[PDB]
Design an enzyme around this catalytic site. Structure first.
Site, short mmCIF file in Angstrom:
data_model
loop_
_atom_site.label_atom_id
_atom_site.label_comp_id
_atom_site.label_asym_id
_atom_site.label_seq_id
_atom_site.Cartn_x
_atom_site.Cartn_y
_atom_site.Cartn_z
N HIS A 51 0.84 -1.19 0.00
CA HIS A 51 0.00 0.00 0.00
C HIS A 51 0.88 1.24 0.00
CE1 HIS A 51 -3.84 -1.89 0.42
NE2 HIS A 51 -3.53 -2.47 1.57
N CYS A 98 -0.69 2.35 -4.26
CA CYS A 98 -1.52 3.52 -4.55
C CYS A 98 -0.73 4.80 -4.35
CB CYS A 98 -2.76 3.55 -3.67
SG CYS A 98 -3.94 2.26 -4.06
#
Lengths: 5, 237, 252, 5
Positions: C197, C240
């Protein structure tokens, strides 16, 4: 002779 | 259906955190190399590969100014790309973007050289050389060149939005924008010392705000600093 | 002749500044699935940056399939950034389709030297299980991405180092150890792959702490990694760069 | 079937 941006 | 932003490529005089060099006689290192490469190689080399030759030149250059902190200093250019095909400009037709219209596209050259002293920003000596160099190159490569000198951050946003909305884009195959100014990481200065975020600039040309340039290559060249320090370089082991 | 502090890097990103990356709970990330398809298919004859163009192509076309939910028909856009100064051909000799000997003979002189065996060391660093104060969920399908890249980089000729579920400190400390390995003196290139992430400019450790990507690239630059000076260094970053879904745009 | 990173 050199200069910065 | 399309993503919000695509088919863009952006060349940068320098890396995040670092500053770009300019020669008070000759102009910036980057525009000088960029113009030299595009002139000789646009007939047989696509834009991405061509920015790699420019990276090669910039990496080999060093500063010459005995006495100052700029003696022997270094610089590294870079490009970031969301193209989905080869960009041949065609001054191979099949796996590359359609680039066949006359003119090849509209091109905007936006130099801030003279600064109204609201902040502490110096005269960009050599800036006039950069500007002339890009207008001739873009005119030689087949582009309807619009120009714009010494703007405020507001004027820049507003006229860059004007430029993006022009009807002429409907009938052309590509687009070019070149911004030359003082800057910081992610933003450039208007002559009033105020900043314009580069994201906003790129936004005005994406697939949602500039539908007339959908699926055609858009080409940004950014000659501004991205930091406050100078690169003294490393020796080679 | 001297060098800038940073040069000869290519970074491939799964999504654009501010946007987010989509991952399929079964088939892996869009970006990784496309990267491994194209690299596997075209290393024999196309150089890595051109290859990354082709991945852009595939990612621009893909759209989300998840009826009901907030992700139906969503889009994504990859990109890549380059301070390379030559073509980067991987000149595969086998595993994937190999290059012909005529191809090398015509392309070798204008390209990075890419002939050592192994071609380089490769590090594949995946965080799928998060256990911290932030709201970071399990990265379903993160295991397919991990084994896809490990198999891909082996087929392409790389000595593949792996790391699973690390804290931001452990990634700083271990990325640095990897960067200082003595094999880089004789190998010809390098590959780092970070799957986790993250946010714009940084990626999360399993402790919900952040490792700034600028520190990562710094570990491999000319000043900190003299053994890789003038050698091409590839980074693939699956993470992301935001928290917003791209609903896409109709084609006028 | 689709989850964000």
């Amino acid at each position: 002779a050199x200069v910065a941006x | 259906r399309l993503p919000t932003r695509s088919d863009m490529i952006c060349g940068y005089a320098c890396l995040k955190g670092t500053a770009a060099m300019r020669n008070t006689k000759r102009g910036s290192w980057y525009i000088e190399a960029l113009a030299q490469v595009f002139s000789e190689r646009a007939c047989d080399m696509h834009v991405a590969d061509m920015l790699v030759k420019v990276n090669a030149l910039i990496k080999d250059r060093e500063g010459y100014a005995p006495g100052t902190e700029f003696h022997r200093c270094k610089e590294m250019s870079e490009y970031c790309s969301t193209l989905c095909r080869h960009l041949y400009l065609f001054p191979h037709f099949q796996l590359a973007y359609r680039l066949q219209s006359r003119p090849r596209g509209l091109a905007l050259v936006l130099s801030n050289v003279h600064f109204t002293g609201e902040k502490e920003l110096e005269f960009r000596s050599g800036g006039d050389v950069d500007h002339s160099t890009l207008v001739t190159l873009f005119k030689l490569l087949g582009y309807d060149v619009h120009v714009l000198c010494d703007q405020t951050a507001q004027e820049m946003q507003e006229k860059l939005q004007n430029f993006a909305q022009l009807p002429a884009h409907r009938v052309t195959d590509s687009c070019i924008v070149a911004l030359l100014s003082h800057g910081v990481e992610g933003a450039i200065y208007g002559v009033d010392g105020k900043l314009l975020q580069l994201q906003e600039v790129f936004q005005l040309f994406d697939n949602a705000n500039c539908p007339s340039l959908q699926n055609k290559p858009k080409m940004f060249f950014i000659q501004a600093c991205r930091g406050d320090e100078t690169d003294r370089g490393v020796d080679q082991q």
